[PDB]
Amino acid sequence: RWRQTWSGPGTTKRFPETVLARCVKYTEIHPEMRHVDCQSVWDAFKGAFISKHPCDITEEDYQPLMKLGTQTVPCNKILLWSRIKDLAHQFTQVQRDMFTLEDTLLGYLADDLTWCGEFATSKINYQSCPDWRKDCSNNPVSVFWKTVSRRFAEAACDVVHVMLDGSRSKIFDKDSTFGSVQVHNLQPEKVQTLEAWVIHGGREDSRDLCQDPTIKELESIISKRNIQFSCKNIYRPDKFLQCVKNPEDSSC
């Protein structure tokens, strides 16, 4: 082929082995996930998209995997993020206290991977997978992240933090998974405050990005859900991580 069926890159090479290895490694490191049989996890993950039309995936398809990956996360220590993933992960690697979705078994298994199957066969499609925009939104990858990002937001309580990319354009994007899914699934009964950390890109002396229109929009949406909103600039993310690693002393 010089064309391919779909517009998205195909399944990550060695997907089955990669996911199984990830599950082993995670369940070795994290003692609460020792009950988990990694073969059963693979089977459930496979069951969600194998032999299914990769534009006809449902949240229901992933329910066997979700059940097997059931995991308690400290509800008051949740860090969400939008667009910008690397700082969030670097932060939680020191601040081994806050947790992102990719710090959970399910997020860890799928992070940075792509997968899809075929309606007519049980073959994994290593050649192309649906693009969310060009092909269909009900594809195996997009559905998985929608389902898991939802459930992770529903687990949160107290003060929930979100890192946003202040170099973007839409610092808060209503169309992102954070904006379209997570914001609307925080539980107002349990969540007291959403606090945004607006992460600056380059910049000499920079603007208070907590005044950005899309930030005000986020404030409005959140406040109308009866959840308080707070915002902080992180003007130099590199000084920020240095202070997380070595608090006190220095220009912290």
Ligand SMILES: NC(=O)c1ccc[n+]([C@@H]2O[C@H](COP(=O)(O)O)[C@@H](O)[C@H]2O)c1
């Ligand atoms: N690790 C991922 O690839 C991934 C994908 C989609 C959503 N999510 C969750 O949603 C948020 C990020 O999605 P957006 O960048 O679309 O806002 C984060 O809270 C993240 O945990 C993660």
